[PDB]
Each structure stands twice: as C-alpha cells, then as structure tokens.
Amino acid sequence: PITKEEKQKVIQEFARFPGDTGSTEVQVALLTLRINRLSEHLKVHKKDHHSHRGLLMMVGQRRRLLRYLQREDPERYRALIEKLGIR
C-alpha cells in the first residue's frame, strides 16, 4: 500500500518549510500519489467498481485544491503542476 516511509518522503519534498504538513502543495502531492496507486490498481481489476468511487472523490478533491491555488497565487500553481506533470 502506502507506508509512512514513502509518506514522509513526499511531505518533506513538497513542504513550503520545515514542519509544514497541511499546505495546499503538500495535500495535492499526497492526493496525487494515491491517484497513481489506484489508477495502476484499476488498470488490472477493471471490475472493481467500489474502489472506482473513491478515486473520483480524490480527483474532485485534487482539482478542488488546484482551482483554489489558481485563484490566490498562480505562480506556485505552475511550479506545482510542472513538478507533478498534470493538466
């Protein structure tokens, strides 16, 4: 799955500063990893429909945070998207 080892590796990479656990950049980073953990789980197991629902809620939440970042500071949005290869 997703262990706390791999978890901290992402938080410290996208932290705006030491100790930051809840920045918009960090949330989108964390959300996007479970996106890829699930989308690669759904390439196989195409008949797993109940897990398909949780994926739609993660994308909606990821785009909800990105649409917010767009409005406040558009630069860090581009620095984030280019760093995650989205859109």
Residues that bind RNA (CB under 7 A): 1-2, 4, 7-8, 11, 19-24, 27, 30, 34, 37-38, 41, 45-55, 57-58, 64-65, 68, 72
Q: Compute the Cα dihedral for 2, 35, 77, 22 and give only its sign.
A: negative
- Quote the least distance from Cβ 82 to RNA, whole Å: 20
Please give the distance of CA 43 from its chain centroid, rounded to a whole number. Answer: 19
Q: Which is nearer to RNA, 45 or 83 (CB)?
A: 45
Residue 40, helix vs strand vs coil: helix
In 1-87, the DSSP E strands lie at none
- Quote the least distance from Cβ 20 to RNA, whole Å: 4
Q: Which residue has the tokens 């030491």?
A: 18
Q: Which is nearer to RNA, 68 or 78 (CB)?
A: 68
- Quote the least distance from Cβ 40 to RNA, whole Å: 8
